[model samples]
Target chain A: TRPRVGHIQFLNCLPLYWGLARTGTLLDFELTKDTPEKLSEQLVRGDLDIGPVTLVEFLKNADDLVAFPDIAVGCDGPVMSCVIVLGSTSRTSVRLAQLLLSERPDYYTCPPDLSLMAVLIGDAALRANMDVHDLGALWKEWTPFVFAVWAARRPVITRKVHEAFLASRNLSLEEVEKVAEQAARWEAFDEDTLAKYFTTLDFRFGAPQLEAVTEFARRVGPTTGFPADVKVELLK
Target chain B: TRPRVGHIQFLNCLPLYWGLARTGTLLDFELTKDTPEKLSEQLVRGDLDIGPVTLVEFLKNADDLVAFPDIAVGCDGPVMSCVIVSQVPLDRLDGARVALGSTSRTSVRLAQLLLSERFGVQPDYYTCPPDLSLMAAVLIGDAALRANMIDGPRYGLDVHDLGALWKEWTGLPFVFAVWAARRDYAEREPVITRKVHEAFLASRNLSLEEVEKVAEQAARWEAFDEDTLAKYFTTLDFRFGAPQLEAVTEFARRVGPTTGFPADVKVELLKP
Candidate 1:
């Protein structure tokens, strides 16, 4: 059977994928790209046995799926990508747009876009009524890790492929230079800035980082409507 | 002129009005009841002169209005109210039914969006005072304090406090409460604005030690003794700067996407 690979296939997450793809590992995988929402919809239906489901998908599938340890797409902290900005208005006006937008079909037309929503709140408020506002300035405010991970179905992949993949992930994280080099090649950023950016990020798959993931999973689980008893389970 | 008042009202905001009303400050004011969304819309449309607004509301209307000087409704830490409690499995729950209080929609939307976007749980929602059987209720201010009174015990609700969440998510002090005025109002009478800001500063720190006296003084709205008054006070953060800026910015970054925000985020601190 051919290896089935799933990913969001976006720019921010490109470096890790590039590193994995170029190394020529012992894995036959099929890559498919789709929106975060559609991809998640496919996973819940069990169309693709295992793949890099969005964070929301992971929470939804927690009951049935088992995630691999030492291989998750984790960011240390102060992720610069996602943020919400409030400008040019009263907090009340900004907040009203937030409420109305949530109920708007425009808001619900697709899955919740975490970064987009933050941008929308600011932009919507800037427009307040008529035209839309540019939100990149505001989106840069709060730092959330925005990259998707490469995941697989628990039952399908062989022990060998799993071990090889884990090793590659570990090796990639250990050498920040490697990540930076690969990221530079992919034009995720230029060499100098990528190195500078990587300086603040911890590529180590350490205990504290794992704790952050667990904390993230735990805190987000209840609020997002995951199983009340849900907690992170790291598979070794 | 009909006072050109900027009435900042939320369900829990009755206290702000309560304080002002005691001096008959609210007698001549025009009343507008709405979620933060409606209030923000009015501000943008130039409807009501001024009112209490959410942090998001302030950002949305920053171009049109200005915030009060060195005064905000903030707390040092641990606002017991503004919790997100649900019965459904929090991780997978999508569109779970939720009840809400009448005041600020800021807390309600933030709780809902953060739960869904960050954690992957989507809640079904309802108006305030929803059926007890529903999954969750988003409460803030006095109502939040009231809910906290019975949260862990009577309701068995798993509370996710916004204050705590704001701190953890943003690494800043929580400033869910803010007071903004219309630019015109501030311009027309700088003295009035100064007085209003000073009054808020005084009232926020006004010792709830005399809850009985304050309650008696504020009996026209809803009568509450010392304990309940203190309870409301604890749920709010009443500070001016640093903590407020840091907390609000963090919340903005975290919830931007779920709220229809674009990229390139920047927070502005405004004044008249």
Candidate 2:
């Protein structure tokens, strides 16, 4: 049987797979397109072999999953896609919501009386008309945060796959304007909004993102590992 | 600018455009493929000129929109893709928390209609994940198909098929989406409007005749076989006739008032 891969169909993750879709490498795997929450659940339940698991789900199932060394969906500053709406796979955003609220003592600086808020992600997060706090900005105040990472269940992190994904990402980044123009039409978002959305976010899995994942690991406490004991399946 | 066309990126909607793409007729318009709710929202906001508008959104904005005479997404019974799974019995959901699926507008409204009028219970609505906290949650599209299986991941403790319930209540087809063109667009470019309309109908007929082909080309996955998908495709009626219009009117009556539309919603269609 071909390896079953889960896909987060949101715009943020589109660039990573656009090249695969274009190059027909996507046919090499059995793919399922779903929200981050569902993809993470499938990964945890062993239904999916490899996919982007939301950061919180990764921490929760670190025993059965290993993050890819330099492949992730994270950001350094203002990630326009993931925000705490005023409202997962919204659990990672939810966890960020909780962490931001709990850790920041000065969050009450807004106002004394607070109603209910939600952790809205993806297009919904981008399109929400009410009050929204950009979690990326808030999280960056302390440390960078990893929203999702390329993870696999059974050490399927081959160098070829990693390079392919990186190559695809680079291809998308190279022609990102065209991608954004088409995506703006496809997803019903403003072209400039999408252009900025694609351009501003840092998709590469880098040191700050890894450090943030470890920091997230330190707080969330992985299900079956020692403190900050998150595992990465490194590839050249 | 080319007249913007809204495309609902589902298997049911694929056939209507398959032939256009196959014949290069699709190049006549700017296309947007998005969820039904978002499509309808953009339609209402004047961003989309033509596409499948959810029936409720069409009803809500009937003055500004005009439905095509013979295009719809409906089912007579047991639409496997629109269901409500509940932790408790339907009657006991009087004031429980229910998470509405964010994917589709019509299904969410139909769920509200069933839970409120059919069950005579008003549930507190939420827009979050159907975690352990939600008493019930609406699941549609692929998630509903997944939940239909015996071993699908449990959202609620029990599954209640909404399509069957609507069928049992009204005994008519439940029309979820209506092919609509903006009234302004229809008025300004009558020839293009008619051309696009014919294009959709032709492709829909082509699709109806070759369900097996459409099913095979629908997507590349192993979740269901050809026969199973062909049957699902058959249940999705693209013809909007008297039966479907009657059902839409009845559906409007049940949930229109509280949903901010009049119960006397009209099925305003484009002129011939």
Candidate 3:
């Protein structure tokens, strides 16, 4: 058995693992899944070797982590997947999501307010608020890959092995022909709604955008002593 | 006998003198026809008491100067006289007559290149004080304040300031404005500088009611209404202290390519 790298799988991370698996890079290894937060914690504790983890997580625990430069899940434009599933029939009734942001621009906005979420939760925890038992609707929104990466300790033992994995992923993509496969599987991204998610929200950096994530880490005080800039790559 | 303060009398600088006069701080200011650079040099060498000097000029020679912080010749948007007037209208224009603000050596050249290369407007410019009568000027700071009176070709000045127009065209705060004073005055009469700086800051750091009041008052003087005054504040930045740091950083980055000045030209902050 090769080094058992722990991975917390999410839909956004499919491209990375898909490429790695198809290439047989981890043929001697086994993959695991957990919440992104949990996976990040595990990676930090050295419980896993390489996994799709948050960059903020890596930054907090950057003692032995090395970021790969070129291979990153970078996109010049929009991405889809992290959904904002709402439980309310009326857009205005969304509660948990609203409690998490700076301001409520409108229901038509992306990445609902977390500040509002805090206020809502704080009010509820104080027993002043009673409407807390609702099973919030899972909103499907694009959660962009910020620090998602196959992080390892150091000397990545085999450059050839990583390349082989990359080559295999590339070959597989060519063979599968994503355009045809996506249409066949009805996996075609909802082009119409995608624009609404991006435009209504600020996605410059971290948090819901890259900036938010970095800002959040800065505020919370990262465990790794430095800010994270880790990410995985999916070759075209 | 009121204090004798020197002033650079240009089209864009009328606002400073006008504002000071209206406020009575400048009861007996001596208006002069010196360029921003020359006026600053004279002020540093103890030649004048108070004047509307260039920010860069003061930075270059800060040993004996202290600028009054409260009053400034500022603008929030397109100031026309610091314009890139062209033989042809801007839309149909190819070549440009760029005016360099004599306040700094770099800004003039920047306006020239940005006008020509970025916009396809060619350049026929000179090293001189910002004159709206020419084809173009890199109008900024005090120049913007004086730009208000320029009423098109009748005054032989009609066009765009590469700075404010760049913002209008590109939506960026072109640069922050500052009023550079002699250090001697600032140190000796810190209260006066503080009072003046506070006045400007008050105008900037206004609550809804305060802004409304100031604009209403300013409108009566400028002959423009509160709506226009309000618009000016909204478009312009008021925190001269912090934004100057940002503008200087931006200045270092955008200026070096055209000005032939070393990118690392030291910006002496004339630290308070």
Candidate 4:
């Protein structure tokens, strides 16, 4: 039986899979695409062996998970996408919601009215035409490192599996422009914007990346309603 | 000797003051205008005998105050002026930093409950002087007018009515500010409280009956035109009837815990 891999169905994730598919580096594994939230749930249920779960999810379910050493989706400054918008219908509630986050309006979720606003990402963020305060940009403004990382269920993540994922990420980076151009067809993403987005991502997990992840986890303690003991444990 | 009275310097409160001033009644009181938050503080400090304090302020210091009958700054539908304008939508505000206005207590607390109960996202709140620089800011009175009328689009913000938001979530009108007086003072001088209530009730009646004149007087204070002022006043429901009372009581139950008041705190009202 082939290994089952989970993929996030967002444009932010295009390069990773595009490279994997083009290089034929991991032919033995079966791939599935869905939302980060659903993928995390699947991982917990022992359905997905490896996936790019949200950092919060990885930490929340850390007991059964391990991090991939050197790959992630992140940005240095304004990501040009990834924002939380308030619909005109309930726009006034944003004031109260902002206060709940320590009196500063923080962006992290989508609004109900699709026409009014939302926390948009991927190709949709480009097509929406509405202005959005980028989450990755804000995350960078607060911390000086990467934003998202890859994780897998511990039982199935051998050293070989980790190495294969890393190789796939590196190969994707090598042909990053081609990946961007190809993704623009279905994603409706601007080729130039896609090219810029790829440059913002970091594939190597280094000391700074670890520091960024650590700081993110530290900051998330107050927001996630989780205990501080919840931590990241990487598969060696 | 004249007693000192305070009221918010908002267009919403203009008709009450305009009506009171126009009435040839022998009113033995000095009137002053200030923000609702400051007026509440003045009431607490005994700087003023009576003022329309924010509803949450009355609840927080309920043991110290009593509300007057048939008067408040409330609305049954969209209160176009008092709003919370955001750069992002409400649902996406999981961990966003929001700025609260320092002008009114009741609207602030009502906003808190709406976000917690309805949106399910607790934002990190900060109190700041109101300005467009803040991603989300609460605006009331004339400033709210200027915001919705002009500043919202200039700053690329999405403005939402706080009253409409509450009504949508609870299916009830929202009372933003209420006429409150020090409990001890009201009880000690029931005759005075009665007169005060009657004067406000009459003023509200006169203001509603003569909209063009009230709007004319109000136009000078705000950047908006007389027609806008006339329409704006109509949107606000000043009567503290059953629906308004229900909204406040439910508000008290939800907002009381964090505000240092008991959920079952008695909502005492004073009348003629």
Candidate 5:
């Protein structure tokens, strides 16, 4: 059976996919794309064979899915996207908002409608204007916060396909302008915003990113009903 | 009129009440002992003039009550009591029936805040005693302490202490109980209100100073041993300091909108 691949539709992930299309790597597999939540759910159900899943989702499926050795959608430096706008959406950032605003929990606790704070991730955060509390920066003061890790269902991932995905990520980083020119068609972002957004991210997942994944897992352990003292079991 | 005071019967509270009796402060007032829930209700209904109520109860009856400054049953970190025990994972408890123990009103509300607000799990809740048949149970006081050890592992359950949850999530102290007096009582007899508060203050101080002795005395009757009781008391933050005030106020604020509680619940100190 041909490999089925999943992609996150959000603009932050466009560089990797743009490179895949440019290098004809997109035709090597069947491609699917959607929201992070939907992709993770599909991955778990075996509807998707390979993709990037949020670190939390990866932990949940660690027994069956192993992460790609190095490539991920992450940043070692400051990130412009992934913020809690004063006036939010991911479940991870939902709890992150509570943790950050806990000193004044009465105001920031709960839903986007009632809460004084909201978590806006990816492209939405790039465009959002009302008082940005950069969640990525705030999280950086404590430790690096990993977003998503390149994941593959254990059975479907072979040595060749894994290296192909990593190579595609490298080529994308090398051609930022081509990636931006293609991404410009998908979103209403200007050259300045697109340039800033593209440069603000780093696709190479490393030690600091892994630290983020571990820290996030520990913090959310009790709330998600997972063991708090659990160690990250990376797939061999 | 003689001040009719309510006292919490938990061993953690024995020091204060014991101090009162030791100092002959009990002679001047009529004393009734019960769970924190009952004491709060009695204080609210004018059955008692002064006593400790759960912070949640204080917020619910904010108009009718005024809290005593610098006195509370709280903790900066893990509180062994005030817990939710469950057979299923807490995040998966949406639509599950949860028994909120009538023995402690604040633990019930704290549990609700953690479940409804933090975990976002909308469990079907009812006020009752701990029933093993239910999907989960909110228990407090000695029962919660014992269950954390016995019921959890034996029955394969999860015991989530509200104090621990609040502390871990917010990094702030969690105030479990606070002393309050009826507004009418404090207004009608200013001298008595001040006198009663002073007596409680003195009793609290004396108890804190001689906690080891108090724990020893409690061990004679309490199911827990002296060392354990003493260890537990050390975890109890009796001071209603700034962090505790901030924590309780935030808690009241978050739970207020949904429960029809006052939007501006103040910790009105009972003063002359």
Candidate 6:
């Protein structure tokens, strides 16, 4: 049976799939695409074997999910499309984008042009003209970890799927220019912008990322009253 | 003409102004007492020259306001009075419907950070008076005390102390409210800012000196005993020094934007 692999249909995720599609390895799995939130929910409900879900989703249900090491959609500085666009009249700031998104659930999927302010997380955010705030840059200034990661439900992950995903990530990173060009074409981002964005992202999960994740969890844990030690459970 | 001053009528603010009342200095200003949210609006709209506004209010209007030196309503640990009573465990509250108290915008933002940033749940929040029918409700001041004592358990609710939770999350005291005046008003008239600052400082000092008496009297307002009231007062650290500064800064960092303030919101202190 083909592994049910979830994918985000966002520009940031283009590299993760570049190699898989080029090498025709994607056909080995039943590939699906959706927004990060939907993909995360699908993975959590055991509908998808593996997917790059939002960091918040992974941390919230770490007990049931296992993560692939050394892969994430993150930026250390300005990420062109990852933005919080404040409504022209609303006074809310970029810092509250995540919370604001949740509070007004109806506004989550509304176009970037609608509402008083909305958290526009992907390529659509790039086209917004009003007050724009970058959460990627904000988190980078606050912590050292990546903002999103690929994870699989423990029951669904197999040795073959894990190695293939990791291998594809490396292969994609090896052909940086080609991956960027493809992404630029697919997402309509300027090639230079995509290339620069690629440089800002770190794909490997290492000690520094782990330390940052720990601090991130520590700061965020008590707010939701999660136990202090709760963290992203990595696949061994 | 005396400057119009806004005072919160909540139990938490009693000590900050009790001494002023005794010394007859409070009469020197036109005082209006209301909830922190109302006071914040009045201050922003130039209705009040000064007020102990919610921390987020200062951040929102930081460009137009300057903070009073060494004045805040902060707690080092569990501020038993600002609490969230939930029918379910904290983890299960992610998508739960939460009823926000209409009294303070800062506490609502604080609860948002916890529920969204900490618990990874973006709760469905709405503004309403405290009701047991909701999955959780934010209760502040005397209402929180009342809920924590009887209503919480009577309604089969679990209580979470927002201040305690914040301290655990950031390892800093939680500054809920701070004294602020319009920057133009305070800057243009330094003498008044100095005088107002001195009045509040003196009031704070006097309240500390007569802690026992203040606690004994305030207890009746919240149905708490003298010992509990004193302990509650002890938990509240009003000195806006280095520790409180860092705490407020962190709070602003975490919560400033949700309330329409910048993440890099600066705490502009007024100097006499």
TM-score of each: 0.44, 0.53, 0.37, 0.52, 0.51, 0.52
lDDT of 3 at A123: 12
Runs of candidate 2 exceeding 4 Å displacement: A1-236, B129-135, B150-157
If candidate 6 were superposed on the true structure by all CA atoms, what would the RMSD be? 26.2
The per-prediction CA RMSD against the true structure, in angstroms, equals: 27.7, 14.2, 25.9, 27.2, 26.3, 26.2
Error of model 1, residue A154, in angstroms: 79
- Alpha-carbon lDDT, every model: 0.51, 0.73, 0.43, 0.69, 0.73, 0.71
The lDDT of model 5 is 0.73
> Against the true structure, whose TM-score is highest?
2
Which residue pairs come into collision in candidate 2? A37-A89, A87-A118
Candidate 3 ranges beyond 4 A from true positions: A1-236, B1-41, B49-51, B62-81, B89-110, B120-122, B127-158, B168-171, B184-238, B256-272
Instruction: Write candidate 6's Cα lDDT for A76-165 as tens digits.
Output: 566655676533211112223544344433432333455343666565666662266676566655535566788878733366677777
- Residue B68 accuracy (lDDT) in model 3: 46
Q: After best superposition, candidate 5 residue A177: deviation in angstroms?
A: 94
Question: Which of candidates 2 and 5 is the stronger one according to DockQ?
Answer: 2
Tens digits of per-residue lDDT for model 1 on B137-194?
A: 7776545654556544576766667767656654566666466667777688576666
TM-score of B-chain for each predicted structure, in order: 0.73, 0.90, 0.57, 0.93, 0.92, 0.93
The ten-residue window of minimal lDDT in model 6 chain A covers A87-96
CAPRI-wise, candidate 3 is: incorrect
Clashing pairs in 5: A88-A118, A88-A119, A89-A119
Candidate 2 structure quality by residue, lDDT tens digits, B1-272 = 56799887655565565555443345456778877878999988989888888888889998888898887888888888788876678899888887887776888889887778778998888775423233278887666665664324543357777789988877777888888888898999798788788878876787688667666755445476676677778877777888888888888988888787899977788777
Model 6 error, position A94 (Å): 66
Tens-place lDDT per residue, model 5, A1-236, is 55788888777777776566544454356678777767888888999888878666777667788787777776655677677662223545555556666623354434334333366676666677326777667776664666787777864335656777877778777777766664554467866677678777877666867776767777777776556665555545
Put down candidate 3 lDDT per residue, B182-209, tens digits, no spaces. 6666667565555545443342333222
Best by lDDT: 5
Q: Candidate 5, TM-score vs. the true structure?
A: 0.51
**Model 4 C-alpha lDDT per residue in residues A1-236, reported as the tens digit of each score:** 45678877766676776556443433335677776667777887888787777666676777878887767765556655455444322221232233233524436455343654354455455456334465555565554445456777774435666677777778778878877765554355577778877777666676777776666656555566555657678767
Docking class of 1: incorrect
How high is the TM-score of chain A in model 1? 0.61
